[PDB]
Symmetry: D2
Subunit: 212 residues, 4 copies
């Protein structure tokens, strides 16, 4: 499993703190983790929470990441943005119970967190705890176990509905503001991490044209 | 302002509790509130959290409601479902601060709540408090006030992106499973509340054909 | 009603933020508020969370304050310290529901809050909300209303037990480390606020001897 | 280490749920756990939250338990009661971070939890998580590690102050309402668990006279 971290500009100063805990849990589980920034350093490429959503969609739909951690001050903006694209099921979690329930009941491929609201002394403990419970069990097993059938069914039906409601990502990538798109993929490590791990060549090819 | 309440089957037994607090705040503010159920009574029409999303989309896009309150056990399923349709900006809130921030920073048209996780003694106090802070200030004013400009801008840019990513609701309504759709709008008060308040005649007309 | 605010050294930088919200709610209700510090300024007299407890006990037992707000990083240290003295019933609250329940179920005379754990973006909103619900209703009314009888009874029985378990405050003041005591009452505004409002002349007299 | 669980009458129906998680964590760690009730069965001996405090004090001061878990609807009543006796340092915790911080910063011998407020779907997950973090590290190590010195010092100073403020437990046991005391120790398993593990023969002897 490949896990990506994406921070927007308001919470970029916490990227190191967040990555430290995510990396620790990932290392323990044998996952691969990629820090796509923002990193909290001067004159780096910038992301808004809306661009976090777009980048999340690019990473997940391409196969470059299997799961994305992102967020903002309250976590709600990034959640709203991530869920505005096809192929993204982005939850919200504030505590470790939220994270476990998300993995077992919803079984999505992204999670948005508050990195400022409620984020103070011991917040990195909460992050570690949350990440641990998020990956404690393989996703989609159901909670409680006896309710797995209807929970899995509804997640399946949601997926079927999303196939009808969203336009395909390639068309979206071509029609959105191209400066907005270019900025979203201008991170210092984007090309390195993305193109090495991308499994959708059509998306890779179009993004190459945007960058070259 | 017209506010709609939508509950799915797992939390239907709490509909009266939830509506009581929502109604109280609404009455105080001079809003109109519509309880679309589920109501928690035997042999009533059923909704899953995925159908909550569809119904939310129908009410908001048609103009039948200006704001929707919904949720499920954890609130995440309904949030995911609501945000899978065009014209819906559905947040999550667990506490009153979450609700205030949602109205001021994101300024969406729906909110999904946990009605089971963390929902115990004094949960109706939390609901009242949450609803009060949700409508304490007119939406989109920004928090803090000095950050209103970039917050309003990003919400605007999200809206622009959603115009490209979602297919139009009418096409969705025609292409989704029609039994799934019919059930979603088979509530005892749906026709009464919806058709009296619907401002989009094309949606009304198609839903009439589904029901007749 | 006279309300006192007491901060220890780790959270002294937040005193202004905390007092602003407490003052606002107090002004609205017609209460009197006294900021006993710490204030977060260089070379001011220092307090630990244990001294917060002692100062709380001095203010409440003397009648100089009717209610005390205090806390520390997590709020637990100050709570433990406050409850180690006679005549003090110090609760804990993290959210507005906690505060309402404390006033109605326990009806104590002090509350300890976390000023660092969970204290981030929008924390001053939480403070205002918490203070508003804390003083929304007169204390000891019971929650729910129908359970007022046993709740009031148990609070009464607790008070009876405390009369047996604690030694009287005057003896405590004489036997504790006198440098520890002197420091606790060496705040720039202690004499001004305390002696003007003290109703127990025996405590006033002994503290005068400690200071003179 | 010997861990005791004490529930009062309002939350007695949750004793099995609570004990299940406490037992699991205890078994994993090689601790001994004793369920002192209430158990949630008809015509059992009753405890109020004030009697929870007294029983906690008896178990800890006697050495019958090294740590006590208790609580009530909100957890605040039991906390207030426990901290009204000598030899008891009873914290409050709502989440796993609270529990870790309590063990490392305060290092007390009891914890009071909310078993109703915020206690709903997945509450037993929260309990397990909380208990796991509570005993993850040996108590009193300090958080962060670099602040261990002043944290340990203040806990030590609190202990010194408590030696002056509380009257000795034996005198308390003799002077409190004796029917109140008798009821507190009339649990079906009290004699079995207490007398087998009591290390203070003076307390054992007096309680024998109360019961015989």
């Amino acid at each position: 499993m490949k896990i990506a971290l994406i921070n927007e500009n308001s919470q970029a100063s916490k990227n190191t703190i967040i990555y430290k805990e995510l990396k620790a849990v990932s290392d323990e589980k044998g996952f691969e983790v990629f820090n796509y920034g923002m990193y909290g350093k001067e004159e780096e490429s910038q992301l808004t929470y809306v661009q976090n959503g777009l980048l999340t969609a690019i990473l997940l739909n391409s196969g470059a990441a299997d799961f994305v951690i992102t967020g903002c001050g309250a976590g709600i903006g990034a959640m709203l943005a991530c869920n505005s694209f096809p192929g993204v099921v982005c939850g919200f979690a504030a505590d470790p119970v939220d994270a476990y329930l998300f993995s077992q009941v919803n079984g999505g491929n992204a999670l948005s967190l508050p990195f400022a609201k409620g984020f103070g002394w011991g917040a990195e403990l909460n992050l570690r705890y949350l990440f641990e419970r998020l990956f404690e069990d393989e996703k989609g097993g159901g909670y409680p176990k006896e309710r797995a059938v209807p929970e899995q069914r509804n997640a399946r039906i949601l997926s079927e509905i999303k196939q009808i409601t969203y336009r395909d990502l390639l068309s979206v990538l071509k029609e959105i503001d191209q400066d907005f798109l270019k900025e979203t993929i201008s991170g210092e490590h984007f090309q390195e991490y993305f193109f090495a791990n991308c499994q959708n060549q059509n998306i890779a090819d179009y993004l190459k044209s945007v960058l070259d």
